[PDB]
Ligand binder design. Structure first.
Ligand SMILES: Nc1nc2c(ncn2[C@@H]2O[C@H](COP(=O)(O)O)[C@@H](O)[C@H]2O)c(=O)[nH]1
Ligand SMILES: [K+]
Lengths: 167, 173
């Protein structure tokens, strides 16, 4: 059966990168990561096809026109986006794909992947009002706790009657 | 309000054993709905712990008075979920847990369409799974318990529930 698409976001600085890293460190599960494309200049120590696929702005816009992104956004004059083909093929192989996107991107993703798992990482306890775009809300109080919560969510998704029924 | 959690599934699948294990875990926060039954009490069972044991007369008078969320006949005996405990306990904010056979679960679904329905499946039925939200295989008791636990945790993390909390809190201030 198809792998899940798992989409993690949250406000900038909430710690989504740190939580994602811990999740991918967990040997109980096996996730695949999408390498994003960007049009920003490559920095010291970075490798094309590892940190990012680095593209010209014209190439990125050609790819947008040909509908080759699940989602994209422009930040300070540079585009960033998730290529569609890798994610599609990888899910078709039966692997769960675990994406990190910026908050407003959920709407774009959900149009193409309505049954994806959308997880909003929230800071500990108003602009956080963008959670309405998401399926689940997980508080990043501590990295280990946030990871465990996300792992219950993904585990539960695998137990969903729809999946098991079709199976 | 707390969640209504419904564990059901085919006869002999091990609903009782898994429920038992769930409530032996000190980290389990749910409150168990003690059912009424008209079957005879068995060695080791305690009235008001395992079940509220009732006569058929009393059970039927309670049916007539609409005092059950659900009830069913199973191998010649009545079993049912008293309404007041579930309503009061959910109102207090506690999750309430039902362990019931499949006909009773259908009645619960009609009255509580947003309840959490978990179907306990044998390690080996497809038609039976239709109304349910989740399917958990009873391959082993500890494994089944843990799966149910992460399903309930995930339901507490649903955005609709979390958002409603945050909104009430912002409006309150
Ligand atoms: N519908 C319904 N089934 C119940 C209730 N309580 C127990 N059962 C089910 O009745 C069956 C017989 O239980 P036992 O007689 O073995 O304790 C089990 O499958 C159990 O899940 C109840 O309150 N309602
Ligand atoms: K019961």
């Amino acid at each position: 059966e198809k792998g899940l698409l798992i989409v993690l976001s949250g406000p900038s600085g909430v710690g989504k990168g740190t939580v994602r890293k811990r999740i991918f460190e967990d040997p109980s599960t096996s996730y695949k990561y999408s390498i994003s494309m960007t049009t920003r200049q490559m920095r010291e120590g970075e490798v094309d096809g590892v940190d990012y696929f680095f593209k010209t702005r014209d190439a990125f816009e050609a790819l947008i026109k040909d509908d080759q992104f699940i989602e994209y956004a422009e930040y300070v004059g540079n585009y960033y986006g998730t290529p569609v083909q890798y994610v599609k093929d990888t899910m078709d192989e039966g692997h769960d794909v675990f994406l990190e996107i910026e908050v407003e991107g959920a709407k774009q993703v959900r149009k193409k992947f309505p049954d994806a798992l959308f997880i909003f990482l929230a800071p500990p306890s108003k602009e956080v009002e963008m959670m309405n775009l998401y399926d689940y809300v997980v508080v990043n109080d501590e990295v280990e706790l946030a990871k465990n919560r996300i792992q219950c969510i993904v585990e539960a998704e695998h137990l969903k009657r729809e999946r098991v029924e079709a199976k």
